[PDB]
């Protein structure tokens, strides 16, 4: 059912979004200034701990 509105079905003057993307100024002359400061950056590690395979064993003891 066409429940609550959502920009896919609206007039061109509608904006909902998906709730978490705050990455800059919001420019005066209709732009966007994405700082370097507020950007997700990841401490992802290298070639992982290799003896740890994807799931533990069933081989009976």
């Amino acid at each position: 059912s066409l429940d609550i509105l959502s920009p896919k079905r609206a007039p061109r003057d509608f904006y909902k979004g998906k709730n978490c993307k705050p990455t800059g100024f919001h420019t005066r002359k209709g732009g966007y200034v994405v700082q370097p400061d507020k950007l997700p950056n990841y401490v992802v590690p290298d070639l992982t701990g290799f003896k740890l395979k994807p799931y533990v064993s069933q081989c009976p003891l």
Partner: protein, 142 residues
């Protein structure tokens, strides 16, 4: 909590079926219909067609019947009305007549456990605690 007093496999005797008078091991226990399937008991002939699986014709397979229509045998071979409890902590909880206590058939495993693999992590990689903490702290993060 003990909603059931008839377990998988244990010898049982029939009551009231179209085949009154028979003893069998319960192959399956449907807890939903409050019913059980017993070996060679409650035969019935299905018609089936199935293309791939060669489901091909009349199958004489065993269909269930209500638990209030089976009663289990004893070393007197009949009525136990086995309700029982001997809560002494020297076992024999189940199956007291109305005398003889049997603690299940001890089947233990319905499905076999695999004894190998490659994609699988070698057994816990031999559980070794991997220095989670030993010197009241080491292995912690940075």
């Amino acid at each position: 909590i003990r909603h059931w007093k008839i377990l998988r496999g244990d010898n049982v005797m029939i009551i009231r079926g179209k085949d009154k008078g028979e003893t069998g091991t319960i192959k399956r226990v449907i807890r939903s219909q409050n019913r059980v399937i017993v070996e060679g008991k409650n035969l019935i002939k299905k018609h089936i067609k199935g293309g791939p699986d060669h489901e091909g014709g009349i199958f004489t397979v065993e269909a269930p019947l209500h638990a209030s229509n089976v009663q289990v045998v004893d070393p007197v071979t009949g009525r136990p009305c086995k309700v029982g409890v001997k809560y002494l902590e020297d076992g024999t909880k189940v199956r007291v007549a109305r005398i003889i206590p049997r603690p299940e058939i001890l089947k233990i495993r319905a499905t076999p456990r695999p004894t190998t693999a490659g994609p699988k992590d070698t057994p816990m990689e031999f559980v070794w605690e991997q220095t989670y903490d030993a010197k009241t702290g080491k292995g912690m993060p940075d």
